[PDB]
Amino acid sequence: ALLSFERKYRVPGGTLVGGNLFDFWVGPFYVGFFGVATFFFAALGIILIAWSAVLQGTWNPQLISVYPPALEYGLGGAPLAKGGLWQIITICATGAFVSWALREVEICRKLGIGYHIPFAFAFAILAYLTLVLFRPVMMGAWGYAFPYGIWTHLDWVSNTGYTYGNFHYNPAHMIAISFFFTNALALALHGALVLSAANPEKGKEMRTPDHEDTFFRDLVGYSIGTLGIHRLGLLLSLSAVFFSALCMIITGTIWFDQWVDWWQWWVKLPWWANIPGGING
Amino acid sequence: DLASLAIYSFWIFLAGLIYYLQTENMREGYPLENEDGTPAANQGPFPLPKPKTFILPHGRGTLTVPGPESEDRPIALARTAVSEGFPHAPTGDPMKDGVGPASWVARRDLPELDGHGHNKIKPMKAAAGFHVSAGKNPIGLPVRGCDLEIAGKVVDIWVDIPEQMARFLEVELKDGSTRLLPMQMVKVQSNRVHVNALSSDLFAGIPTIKSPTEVTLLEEDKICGYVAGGLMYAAPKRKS
Amino acid sequence: AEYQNIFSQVQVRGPADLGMTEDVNLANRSGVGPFSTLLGWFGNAQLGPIYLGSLGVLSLFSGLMWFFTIGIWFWYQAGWNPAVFLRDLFFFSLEPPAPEYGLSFAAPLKEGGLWLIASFFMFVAVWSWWGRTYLRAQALGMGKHTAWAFLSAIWLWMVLGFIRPILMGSWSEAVPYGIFSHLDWTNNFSLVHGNLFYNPFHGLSIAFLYGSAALFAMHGATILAVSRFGGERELEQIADRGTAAERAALFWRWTMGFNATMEGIHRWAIWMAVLVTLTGGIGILLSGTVVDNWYVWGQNHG
Ligand code: BCL
Ligand code: BCL
Ligand SMILES: CC[C@H]1c2cc3[nH]c4c(c3C)C(=O)[C@H](C(=O)OC)c4c3nc(cc4[nH]c(cc(n2)[C@@H]1C)c(C(C)=O)c4C)[C@@H](C)[C@@H]3CCC(=O)OC/C=C(\C)CCC[C@H](C)CCC[C@H](C)CCCC(C)C
Ligand SMILES: CC[C@H]1c2cc3[nH]c4c(c3C)C(=O)[C@H](C(=O)OC)c4c3nc(cc4[nH]c(cc(n2)[C@@H]1C)c(C(C)=O)c4C)[C@@H](C)[C@@H]3CCC(=O)OC/C=C(\C)CCC[C@H](C)CCC[C@H](C)CCCC(C)C
Ligand SMILES: COC(C)(C)C/C=C/C(C)=C/C=C/C(C)=C/C=C/C(C)=C/C=C\C=C(C)\C=C\C=C(/C)CC/C=C(\C)CCC=C(C)C
Ligand SMILES: CCCCCCCCCCCC[N+](C)(C)[O-]
Ligand SMILES: CCCCCCCCCCCC[N+](C)(C)[O-]
Ligand SMILES: CCCCCCCCCCCC[N+](C)(C)[O-]
Ligand SMILES: [Fe+3]
């Protein structure tokens, strides 16, 4: 079935690999080469996860967990039931995600739009790979990566965090968090703004973008504008992710002590380091 | 206990929300259709919501969605296969016929108005007293297509008055008529404006506006559609 | 090669936009400010005008009294030394009264009475600012979504500083005004209630925060990819669907098998954002009042 306006857009073309061979849909979903690749990678990944859950002895989805190889294996391979499966599933996941993005590119080309979406998505992917590939490799073992289980990954997040005291003191994490919070603030404002104009007081005519500008200027003295706010959401969102990755890529690699002590560089600057009084003198 | 109750309740609320949200987002494009226009057998588990009505400013009337859907235009495409799910081939020139990535919607053939009832987009020369405030002024540059041939020259910027931003370049062709180019589909370089989407021979085929000094939503759609369509349909003449 | 619409290539300016009048009292509107060419590469160049009525003045005098009160304490902790002040900026902290004092206003200035005064000014600032989000919309004829969304934030803020302490029986449960101190409070709060990863509302709160970032990235990316068709003109795309809105919808339909409308996406967005602080405030409010330990709670599925 098609949306009422869809047919005219369903033309040949736009594929990156295999010309017309895979140029078709299944219900709503475009396929393409990268739809085939995505299904192969994902189906395999899921099979091996199920296989891992047999080897672990549980079907409970809240208990299923796939751990990477223990630290003694370094960056080498490991028997399937002691981390090798996690390694294969990770290759599957990376295949599936990158394929997902490339399929998004094919869709973009067919529709004649910009590539911003997959490019954005590529940030989520690089953050995933920071945790499972770049950081483990820089640290020397797969075992520094996170395990694949709903609750076990949270367990990793706590252990990983508290290895460095309170992780709040990672300055790169502080910037990330600010972007995450700021982004959500902006998302709330954007959605409310557009909806307040499209859905004015009972009886009244739709408001205009001039009203939206006016509301914001009256409220805070500035309007970023309708192009502005979409540019902003993108920036905030991806900057949050960029600094997330960075907060972890440096952790256990260039800084591995307690994050809280990093800050002494500032407190110890020669010009005020010894002055008595305050909290640190 | 209270936390159990709170959390149980919240999942219930959250399912209601997803239902409201999903259904609200079926105010356009539904009912689903088969490839020949008729309603599809399977519409899914969410029903269409009760209609809502937007009152439009400046006596433009109302919009009520959901409501009767239809392209209000011909569609020069045909099936390339005997079952659902395959591409539909352009029956003509898909750039000229407005299909594929060259697609347009039959929007209203009037201009977007600002909050005062004035045309939102004007050529800069009729917009007192707008002017380029930063960046390189494209007015005067030659315009180059993806064949690397000069297709015209820029004679004005059309600007969005209320939001104060450039929306189109007006370009003049060998024959003295002009076309609008969407601002987002041109690179202003130091000595020219480059247009990757279009080869020089396709500038004449840019849909043309009925009045030199306004542009309607219908026309913006044909222009923006035609130009983007060149990404796919003019690739034999791009070039690098 | 090709151009991406993250930054503008050409700015244009005309006379400053004083805005729509509707039922706004224009006496209370400032005048336009500077135009910033720097800002213009990314969004709008026009600064001002702003609206300042009685609520606005109140809100902002109060907001400053909050900030100046915390700041006066910072200098005092610094023994009035400018160098120590900058050195120890992130370490200073205005702390609430000690448990001893319960919910009373009895506590000496240096032992948390000053925190009460700061907190009083902040309470006036925020609620009056709230009243402002509602009214500036009323005066323009707009819906009140903004006030309703800002209320979700407020809820979390109220729960942390006012409601939870009241139910807990003491001001010492509240959050201290300081950079490092507030992060120590946060960490310590999770430890003291058994790790908030076991608080199901915390897990939702996270889902929506992360979800908020995915949605805004999707949405913003999407609008930019169809801005060559006028996609950012959202309100007219809602009133008369064009090819921008259709290619948006179809990108997503073809990608994940369903999609939104130009209006509906903004509802997904308002709710994704507001559920962060909505779920969050509840999770927090339940903590210590009803649940002393989320791990333990979790062990009884409830
Ligand atoms: C005790 C814990 C420590 C702490 C330890 C850590 C550790 C350790 C980490 C973080 C990380 C983060 N911390 Mg912390 N952090 C703490 C307290 C906080 C607090 C707070 C309120 O106190 C906040 C707001 C944060 C916030 C953050 C974020 C900046 C970041 C997580 C987002 C992210 O990276 O996404 C990036 C997004 C992804 C990785 C998702 C990618 C998804 C892929 C591409 C696709 C998935 C597809 C899926 C399988 C599809 C399924 C099928 C269906 C179709 C759906 N932390 C405390 C102090 N924090 C993490 C970080 O920065 O990671 C880089 C990190 O590793
Ligand atoms: C070690 C720390 C603990 C932890 C302890 C806590 C505690 C304690 C809390 C959270 C809370 C949250 N946690 Mg946690 N959390 C942990 C680990 C994490 C991790 C991770 C490990 O990756 C993440 C991603 C998170 C994420 C989150 C957020 C989803 C959530 C806060 C939402 C928000 O928007 O707050 C920010 C939004 C606000 C605070 C609202 C502010 C609104 C007011 C009105 C603004 C006033 C501004 C003022 C006037 C100043 C004006 C200046 C202007 C410039 C003019 N936590 C670990 C387990 N977390 C909060 C929550 O809801 O928990 C359920 C919370 O209380
Ligand atoms: C839905 C959840 C998200 C959210 C939503 C949200 N926040 C909101 C809103 C919404 C819908 C508003 O409408 C409101 C707003 O107006 O935004 C523009 C707001 C708001 N969110 C704010 C902050 C905020 N929101 C946060 C978070 C969130 N907000 C959540 C992620 C956070 C975090 C993450 O911690 C913060 C810090 C404010 C920008 C604003 C509320 C403003 C307010 O209450 O003002 C009172 C205080 C003052 C008026 C003055 C403060 C003192 C200054 C620090 C001094 C500096 C200079 C001075 C202001 C200049 C004056 C000079 C004079 C000499 C003239
Ligand atoms: C970069 C900014 C934010 C962002 C952006 C973003 N996400 C995106 C996009 C963008 C632009 C898409 O275009 C794409 C999409 O299609 O969304 C609908 C997507 C997407 N973001 C998703 C998820 C996601 N994004 C997240 C975060 C973020 N996404 C960032 C905050 C998170 C978090 C915060 O945890 C999640 C869980 C998906 C819904 C979708 C990508 C879907 C996809 O890639 O499909 C192909 C893969 C499969 C169908 C499954 C593969 C299965 C594997 C082989 C096995 C499973 C392995 C996995 C490692 C198990 C881990 C389990 C445990 C951790 C519990
Ligand atoms: C340079 O020096 C000058 C003098 C210019 C000023 C400098 C000042 C400085 C450096 C200020 C720094 C301020 C900082 C860092 C503030 C940080 C604040 C933070 C992080 C606050 C975080 C959380 C706060 C919360 C959750 C507060 C909630 C508050 C409430 C809910 C209000 C509750 C109200 C109460 C208890 C009062 C009730 C009173 C009556 C009378 C009913
Ligand atoms: C909130 C963000 C503030 C705006 C800062 C961005 C300034 C960058 C200017 C990019 C210059 C573009 N240029 C000259 C090539 O056209
Ligand atoms: C705008 C609504 C979108 C809904 C997103 C819902 C994601 C649910 C994720 C699981 C939550 C975790 N926990 C522990 C509470 O179960
Ligand atoms: C949904 C929020 C429900 C809050 C329930 C309030 C119960 C009040 C009893 C709190 C007990 C705490 N204390 C320390 C006084 O014992
Ligand atoms: Fe939008």
Side-chain angles (χ1 to χ4, degrees), chain A residues 1-201 203-281, chain B, chain C:
Chain A
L2 267 43
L3 300 169
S4 64
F5 50 82
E6 173 163 0
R7 194 191 179 188
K8 75 189 176 282
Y9 297 102
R10 286 211 175 181
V11 287
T15 78
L16 307 161
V17 169
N20 58 237
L21 234 187
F22 295 109
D23 198 2
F24 61 87
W25 292 259
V26 158
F29 306 95
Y30 183 64
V31 174
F33 179 63
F34 293 106
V36 178
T38 307
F39 177 102
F40 164 82
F41 283 124
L44 188 51
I46 289 157
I47 275 153
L48 296 169
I49 288 171
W51 196 14
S52 164
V54 163
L55 302 181
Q56 179 186 338
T58 186
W59 283 105
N60 190 330
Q62 296 219 103
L63 298 190
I64 290 174
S65 173
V66 189
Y67 302 84
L71 294 173
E72 68 205 282
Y73 287 100
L75 295 153
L80 293 199
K82 319 173 70 58
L85 280 163
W86 176 96
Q87 295 174 302
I88 293 170
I89 290 165
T90 288
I91 291 160
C92 284
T94 297
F97 298 157
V98 172
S99 300
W100 187 263
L102 286 166
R103 168 168 168 273
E104 281 185 341
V105 179
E106 285 196 316
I107 291 170
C108 285
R109 290 148 61 74
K110 190 179 295 301
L111 286 169
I113 72 183
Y115 296 135
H116 302 64
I117 301 162
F119 171 87
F121 183 44
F123 281 65
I125 292 176
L126 294 173
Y128 169 77
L129 296 180
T130 296
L131 305 178
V132 297
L133 173 64
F134 310 133
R135 175 185 182 259
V137 163
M138 290 193 81
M139 289 182 67
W142 297 116
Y144 292 115
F146 73 87
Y148 303 149
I150 292 162
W151 292 103
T152 51
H153 82 295
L154 271 58
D155 161 72
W156 178 97
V157 161
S158 256
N159 306 140
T160 300
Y162 278 113
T163 306
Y164 310 96
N166 180 345
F167 210 65
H168 291 150
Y169 291 91
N170 176 332
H173 186 257
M174 266 163 182
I175 291 164
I177 285 174
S178 314
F179 282 119
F180 272 110
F181 282 173
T182 305
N183 166 262
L185 162 40
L187 183 71
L189 294 176
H190 185 56
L193 193 61
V194 175
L195 290 172
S196 69
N199 301 279
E201 304 188 318
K204 298 197 155 70
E205 313 157 291
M206 289 180 79
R207 262 93 274 258
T208 65
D210 326 7
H211 293 81
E212 292 177 298
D213 284 337
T214 293
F215 171 84
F216 245 77
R217 291 175 171 145
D218 284 338
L219 194 63
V220 312
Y222 182 61
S223 196
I224 197 168
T226 60
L227 182 63
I229 191 55
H230 296 80
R231 277 166 173 177
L232 183 61
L234 188 55
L235 208 92
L236 289 179
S237 46
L238 306 185
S239 299
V241 183
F242 169 86
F243 283 105
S244 303
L246 183 74
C247 93
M248 297 298 293
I249 195 60
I250 68 194
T251 288
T253 56
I254 81 197
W255 180 267
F256 46 71
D257 305 300
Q258 302 282 289
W259 273 111
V260 70
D261 300 312
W262 182 81
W263 294 87
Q264 288 186 210
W265 82 262
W266 176 266
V267 177
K268 294 329 193 191
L269 294 156
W271 50 84
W272 49 45
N274 296 303
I275 308 192
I279 312 291
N280 297 310
Chain B
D1 91 294
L2 223 287
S4 284
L5 172 92
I7 194 55
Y8 172 62
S9 302
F10 182 85
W11 288 103
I12 281 168
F13 163 77
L14 186 46
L17 187 74
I18 284 163
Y19 187 78
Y20 159 87
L21 285 165
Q22 192 39 40
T23 51
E24 284 298 309
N25 279 289
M26 293 164 46
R27 289 177 186 286
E28 301 252 356
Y30 289 80
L32 304 184
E33 293 186 352
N34 315 288
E35 315 190 326
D36 68 343
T38 62
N42 178 48
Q43 298 290 328
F46 301 91
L48 288 174
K50 308 276 76 171
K52 69 184 281 180
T53 288
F54 293 101
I55 309 171
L56 313 219
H58 317 306
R60 304 256 170 112
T62 72
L63 171 76
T64 304
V65 275
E69 284 281 11
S70 69
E71 299 299 273
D72 297 348
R73 50 151 304 185
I75 306 296
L77 286 180
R79 270 202 165 166
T80 55
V82 317
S83 48
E84 288 254 318
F86 288 85
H88 302 85
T91 55
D93 185 334
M95 298 281 304
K96 282 150 181 207
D97 293 322
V99 295
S103 271
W104 51 271
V105 175
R107 315 184 80 196
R108 178 84 124 299
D109 200 18
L110 306 170
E112 193 164 341
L113 302 173
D114 59 37
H116 284 109
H118 300 294
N119 286 1
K120 188 186 171 41
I121 296 151
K122 285 163 142 74
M124 206 177 38
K125 78 180 67 70
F130 286 72
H131 56 285
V132 181
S133 55
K136 156 86 185 178
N137 189 334
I139 299 170
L141 297 174
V143 173
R144 193 174 61 164
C146 62
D147 55 348
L148 302 188
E149 301 294 347
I150 298 314
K153 62 149 196 192
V154 181
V155 304
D156 206 4
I157 301 168
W158 291 45
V159 296
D160 182 322
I161 276 78
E163 312 206 65
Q164 297 204 19
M165 52 151 287
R167 293 220 170 265
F168 297 95
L169 301 189
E170 181 174 355
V171 186
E172 171 167 346
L173 310 178
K174 223 210 157 166
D175 75 344
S177 61
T178 67
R179 301 297 189 276
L180 304 195
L181 275 300
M183 200 56 206
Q184 301 89 356
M185 296 296 290
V186 303
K187 194 197 176 201
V188 187
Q189 301 180 279
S190 92
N191 60 166
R192 85 173 75 77
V193 169
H194 185 76
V195 191
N196 184 52
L198 290 187
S199 59
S200 62
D201 52 302
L202 300 173
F203 283 66
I206 303 173
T208 59
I209 60 184
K210 101 270 166 239
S211 319
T213 64
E214 74 176 39
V215 65
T216 64
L217 296 162
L218 190 58
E219 308 163 316
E220 295 188 53
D221 241 48
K222 304 184 175 184
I223 292 155
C224 295
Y226 181 90
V227 171
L231 290 175
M232 171 179 298
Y233 299 114
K237 294 163 207 163
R238 182 179 319 111
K239 202 130 205 169
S240 179
Chain C
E2 209 165 10
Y3 164 67
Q4 303 311 135
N5 222 340
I6 315 308
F7 302 109
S8 301
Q9 306 185 76
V10 184
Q11 300 187 34
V12 303
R13 180 174 317 165
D17 207 318
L18 301 136
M20 294 312 316
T21 298
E22 299 298 348
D23 287 18
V24 177
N25 181 4
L26 306 187
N28 295 341
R29 228 175 234 167
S30 86
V32 313
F35 282 77
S36 172
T37 294
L38 189 72
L39 253 40
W41 295 113
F42 192 65
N44 278 337
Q46 162 172 334
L47 274 297
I50 188 159
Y51 184 91
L52 274 335
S54 291
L55 267 187
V57 165
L58 172 54
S59 195
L60 137 72
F61 161 90
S62 201
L64 292 165
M65 290 303 276
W66 171 66
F67 187 78
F68 291 145
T69 299
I70 290 160
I72 241 58
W73 182 248
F74 277 18
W75 286 100
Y76 178 85
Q77 276 188 121
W80 313 93
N81 187 330
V84 159
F85 183 79
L86 295 183
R87 180 190 70 205
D88 285 358
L89 196 51
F90 293 175
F91 305 74
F92 299 127
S93 184
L94 186 56
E95 305 269 341
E100 283 72 83
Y101 294 109
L103 282 180
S104 80
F105 300 154
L109 297 198
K110 295 170 209 176
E111 283 164 60
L114 222 29
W115 174 95
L116 273 159
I117 291 168
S119 304
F120 172 76
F121 290 132
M122 203 207 190
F123 184 97
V124 183
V126 170
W127 282 111
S128 71
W129 192 265
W130 179 79
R132 189 183 161 74
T133 69
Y134 183 96
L135 294 175
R136 304 292 94 236
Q138 176 164 261
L140 288 164
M142 298 179 84
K144 310 299 165 303
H145 304 68
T146 306
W148 298 123
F150 175 37
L151 202 62
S152 185
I154 285 172
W155 161 242
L156 174 59
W157 158 80
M158 278 287 280
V159 159
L160 289 167
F162 185 80
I163 302 167
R164 183 173 176 283
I166 284 174
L167 298 180
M168 280 308 278
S170 91
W171 299 125
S172 54
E173 289 291 319
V175 185
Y177 304 113
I179 303 316
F180 294 161
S181 53
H182 104 286
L183 314 155
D184 293 342
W185 186 94
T186 300
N187 174 235
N188 155 305
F189 189 104
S190 171
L191 296 168
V192 155
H193 301 270
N195 187 347
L196 281 181
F197 289 150
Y198 301 107
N199 181 338
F201 289 98
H202 190 255
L204 288 165
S205 192
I206 288 174
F208 295 122
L209 188 63
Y210 291 170
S212 283
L215 202 38
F216 215 161
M218 293 157 63
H219 180 64
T222 286
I223 290 301
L224 293 188
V226 293
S227 72
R228 69 189 48 181
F229 310 105
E232 72 264 54
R233 290 139 66 171
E234 296 188 305
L235 290 166
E236 208 61 30
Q237 289 270 343
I238 286 165
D240 189 11
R241 204 184 63 233
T243 187
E246 289 181 359
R247 291 169 202 241
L250 284 170
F251 176 90
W252 289 109
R253 195 175 184 73
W254 292 352
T255 295
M256 61 182 191
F258 72 108
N259 61 267
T261 71
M262 191 64 82
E263 190 196 352
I265 189 69
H266 298 93
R267 295 187 182 279
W268 284 107
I270 199 178
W271 282 100
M272 180 68 77
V274 330
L275 291 168
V276 174
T277 39
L278 197 292
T279 59
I282 285 162
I284 297 323
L285 170 70
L286 288 179
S287 301
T289 58
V290 168
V291 177
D292 284 316
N293 184 308
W294 294 100
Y295 175 73
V296 175
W297 187 84
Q299 285 293 310
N300 302 252
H301 313 304

